[PDB]
Design an enzyme around this catalytic site. Structure first.
Site, PDB file in Angstrom:
ATOM      1  CG  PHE C  44      -1.899  -1.027   0.895  1.00 53.28           C
ATOM      2  CD1 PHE C  44      -2.600  -1.551  -0.308  1.00 53.28           C
ATOM      3  CD2 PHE C  44      -2.261  -2.019   2.759  1.00 53.28           C
ATOM      4  CE1 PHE C  44      -3.158  -3.119   0.148  1.00 53.28           C
ATOM      5  CE2 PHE C  44      -3.132  -2.951   2.636  1.00 53.28           C
ATOM      6  CZ  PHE C  44      -4.031  -3.123   1.425  1.00 53.28           C
ATOM      7  CB  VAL C  45       4.568   1.757   0.078  1.00 54.44           C
ATOM      8  CG1 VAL C  45       5.608   3.419   0.258  1.00 54.44           C
ATOM      9  CG2 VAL C  45       4.938   1.440   1.379  1.00 54.44           C
ATOM     10  CB  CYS C  46       2.891   6.529  -3.363  1.00 59.18           C
ATOM     11  SG  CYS C  46       0.789   6.938  -2.451  1.00 59.18           S
ATOM     12  N   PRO C  47       4.549   4.098  -4.764  1.00 57.26           N
ATOM     13  CG  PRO C  47       3.433   2.137  -6.254  1.00 57.26           C
ATOM     14  CD  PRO C  47       3.093   3.459  -6.135  1.00 57.26           C
ATOM     15  CB  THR C  48       5.963   8.080  -5.358  1.00 56.37           C
ATOM     16  OG1 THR C  48       6.977   9.338  -5.709  1.00 56.37           O
ATOM     17  CG2 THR C  48       6.584   7.599  -3.849  1.00 56.37           C
TER      18      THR C  48
END
Lengths: 165, 163, 166, 168, 165, 168, 165, 165, 166, 163
Positions: C44-48
């Site tokens: 759920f971490v942003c793949p930013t």
């Protein structure tokens, strides 16, 4: 002590008369050498001992004696101390940097809890044998004159083995 | 790497704003600490990395962050260099001397064949946990700005657990 | 740290632009490499961070710099994540799968508790030497911009050895 | 080297002015001591170093400094040597016998392939700390006046710490 | 083989019908458990084995049996797969993620070569004892119905202790 | 004990009739040898054992037997002792110096806590084999006539094997 | 598990239809082999498992499969049992005696506690690779027919290499 | 050598004047002891050494000195040799049998390749300290008289310590 | 050899007169015991040795001597062999099964190559001490008569210690 | 036990019919050998076991069997005992002395706490393979007849492999 043993191989950077050079044991072969150890550059005690040796340097070179001062500082530090201190400025002999402590450990002269070398002087003959050792606590000066006397005496003994009395 | 591990106990002498002091892990407990390692004082490489951290020291003290620069030179040499280099003179944080190399080996950051530390920076939180690590070869500078950024983010995270 | 050491041999499967390929240390020899480790796909971490690298990939390729993202997930999982995330889909560089953890351990970057790799980036030169290392705890982001500056500086000194201070 | 370490415990017999006494580290506590090692009694080399130290023994004692010459010979042999050498006869300090080489090894001063001690001098302060060390090869002489200077410097520094010349 | 030994403790994350949960050895005590190991999520091979198990799920849950599929993939990856595959979306039992390989290793089922578990199924009774084992090479299928038979017989033998011939 | 074993190689300095010579195991080959160990020169105990062996040295030599007295003192010290003792002065055999204690340890005869050799005598035949061993505590004397008897018996048995008294 | 590994060499005595013979790993090369392990001869438990295998024997021998039952009993004891038991007398395949426990140990199938092998079946292909494994606790039965299925699929997958979905 | 060391504990059977007794170190405490070692009973050399000691036994007992002859033979053999040899018959002191070789090894007097003791004599004082040692090759006789002289000298020294000269 | 040593603890299943029992070193304490090892049941060798012991069992029981035959076969196999051989059926003493080989190894009597016990007989007294050992290669027979004489002699000396020679 | 293993190399002195000889494993190669161990010479136990073997020596020499009695005593003691005991005087086979105990330890037959051998008999075939072993505590005699029987059976078996 290390009296009468052969020095060990080493390879260090040194500062000598404005230039950086490399010193190894090969450089001592065939000559008389003095390894002058001290704790550290830029402390608050005066470098009289190193200066006294510089005062007698010319005379030591006449005798064919090379001088190498050694501390665990880098040769870079040596260059800076050489141009910040009037006394150190008088030094024309090589100032070896021993940051790994290997040269210092070769002579079993390391204070392991400080990472600094003890105030020890070693006289080495052309065959790489230690003929004179002098170690002193802070404040008990090492006299360059007595050093010259010992070297002359050691050089004499090598030319006139077995001096009957 | 040492990421997310606890720093080890240490006791070293340092030069800080004109005075010689002692520093231990105990002085870091309860604070954010930056351990900035570099090879040696008085070399011919521009001291921009150290000066850059100095420029941002003001701001770091505000975030409650202490800065300790570290080299295998003595505190005596740091004092001398601090009086010789205009860039180093800007430094108001502690310059730690690690002549025995113990502080350096603690952060597993020693070049054993040279007796000098690698160019490494570590960010340590109030609990002694390394939260950010940066290491580079000579010539590849460390950006103080990027450091501050990492530190603020590190601080956010500690007060806003997983988002 | 592993600064200034040569990378170790390795052999993994990866997903790169719709296909499955095999990467070994052979592919990195003679080139500049970036190994970008991350903990896990489909989190759920942003793949930013990965997309951020994608954004600079064109300039990186132009500079002779290959990029390899790495996680202990399989290359099968990477294919899925890639055709599932708008961000991850922008990636044209190889996505290595390291389920044995070997590649990750070669770089001493394993969180042995979680079986996942730490968030670390490594820059390797044509001779295999690590010239830059960066590691951060979860939540602390890596700036692709900073990576680019470092890579350029790295290439610069390789070309201009011992450049004393002006 | 052994610089700045504390001397180790020891128990040896010695010959001091026509007598045989025992000497232990306790005898050195609260005093300044000079441990003077040499290879062997009755040899051909002139006992110059031993005599020079004998001459300056008055002064040394005025300074509260005790002297102990040491060799791997026995005390019995020292007594004999003291009766036949005119030079050794003028020795009034204790001549320690170290046949087991324990004293000699305590100061790491043993030539193992000869079973004889090396030419080494050690200055030990009242707390038993070694403040000065000197070792030379045969033929290279140890100067008693140079020793006196060092001893006075060691006493001065003990009495006045930090009074070491300031840099610039 | 691990036949007739007690399972080892473990703590893993898993996906079970829309939510994430934590499974531990404690969740097996006093219950019949089936551990179903498979190599990897999102593969090109038919999810038949896992699907054929989902079908008999209502039945199994009735016999007081719990089902745990296990893979070295994370549970995040399991959620994703139980959403892109029709067969996989039928799974109501817990899909355990085993990225550290501890659960797989507890059952000596790791293919150290690949970091993936082998095709193995284990039957564990309420006392945590493995009563049936089945390992298959990629290709041979694991008969879901036959698994049920084993459970029935295993469940009987447990109720009516060794019934001589 | 070392009975019936071969002596080990050695190289020591000694004092033999106003001279300093070197002695090695080669010097003993093809000869009968007596290695006489004692603790120390110049001590208070009467050098009785040393003198008794000196008296019987004429006879020993007639028999082709060489004598070597040994102690951890140096040869230099033996020369000195030989000049001051009337008894030691009558010694014409070699007085070996063993400062490293190597000779003494070869014969496993070292009192380690004293660095002095024990009172032990060893009879070694022409092939270097130890045929007789005698060791005594201080105060218990070694009889040179008893030694002579053993030596002659050792020579007789070497010359006439099996001629040992038959039983009944 | 031993899944997908090569069987280890072995030399054992066995009983096969009225005569004694020697089986070795060489007799398996280029052939499909089934190793059927059971605890002990002359027990009070129904020889069902072994008998249910004898039935499908003609079929198996047709698929190019050899059957070897294995027990830590001697082959002498096997001959005797294939003469006092009706079910056992139907066995045409080799009954291997493994008194040293080497064959059982090669397959990691020994119950060190009892000196008897566990209830395990292995499928080995012509290259000596184990393709299917089944271990059952005393009581649960080993379905002979299901074994055949596994062999068919195993035999197929071998002919038509991994056939994707 | 063992000069000046304390004897070690021992426990052996011995033959003494027609009787079998047990001897241990406790039996030597507070007395002067002579341990007389020899290779073996019944050989072809005459027991003159053992006989010479027997001739001086009475005088040795006056001095309070116990004698123990020792060989690796058994005490049974000793009894038989005592009644087969005129010389041995004269022995009234204890003849210890040391078949295990422990007593002999205690005195470091074993010829390991023969299993027989060397011709060694040890004089032990009341405190268990060895004050005199004598070892001889075959044919070089050990003189009982010199033995008496040494013992008297050793007893004298113990009564008059530090005998100035 | 194991002569004069105490037997080690053990626990095996045996067939004795139609039933299955458990034997441990506890059963031998306080009694005289004979452990008769043999290689295998149902072999083509004539059971003459075991039956021979059976023939003397009545006299042995009368003398307080228990007997235990031992092989690495199971106790199940012994039951069968016993109801299969006219000779073996004469046996009324316990027939121990030692499939783990433990009992056999306690007596250092295992042919490790064959997994079968060597043909050895051991006589154990009430205190557990081995007083007589006999071992022979295949084909060399053990005489039950000789065993009986030895057992009697053993019992005799236990009762008459140190009986010097007349 | 040592059953079916090969005897080890050995060199001992012995007394045989009035003479002293040397015996080694080499003297056994190609022959049947009986190694008869016993505790000690000159004890108070009746020498019936040794004499009994002597009574059958005649017959054993016919079957090509050598007999070696062994104790930790010397060959010298055996000579003496052979002249003292009427029973021992009947012995015409070699009486081996094993003062070092090496021959005894070879057959793993030493009572280490006594320095004497246990009462053990071993039958060795021409190839050095122990084919029969018998050990008993004191008071439990070894029957020479049973020994001969075992030896004949041993000989049969070697010429009639498995029946």
């Amino acid at each position: 002590s290390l009296i009468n043993t052969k020095i060990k191989p080493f390879k260090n950077q040194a500062f000598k008369n404005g230039e950086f050079i490399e010193v190894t044991e090969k450089d001592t072969e065939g000559r008389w050498s003095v390894f002058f150890f001290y704790p550290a550059d830029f402390t608050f005690v005066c470098p009289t001992e190193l200066g006294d040796v510089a005062d007698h340097y010319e005379e030591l070179q006449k005798l064919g004696v090379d001088v190498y001062s050694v501390s665990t500082d880098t040769h870079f530090t040596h260059k800076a101390w050489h141009s910040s201190s009037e006394t150190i400025a008088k030094i024309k002999y090589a100032m070896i940097g021993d940051p790994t402590g290997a040269l210092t450990r070769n002579f079993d002269n390391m204070r392991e809890d400080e990472g600094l070398a003890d105030r020890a002087t070693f006289v080495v003959d052309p065959q790489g044998i230690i003929q004179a050792i002098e170690v002193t606590a802070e404040g008990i000066g090492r006299d360059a004159s007595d050093l010259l006397r010992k070297i002359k005496a050691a050089q004499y003994v090598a030319a006139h083995p077995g001096e009957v009395c």
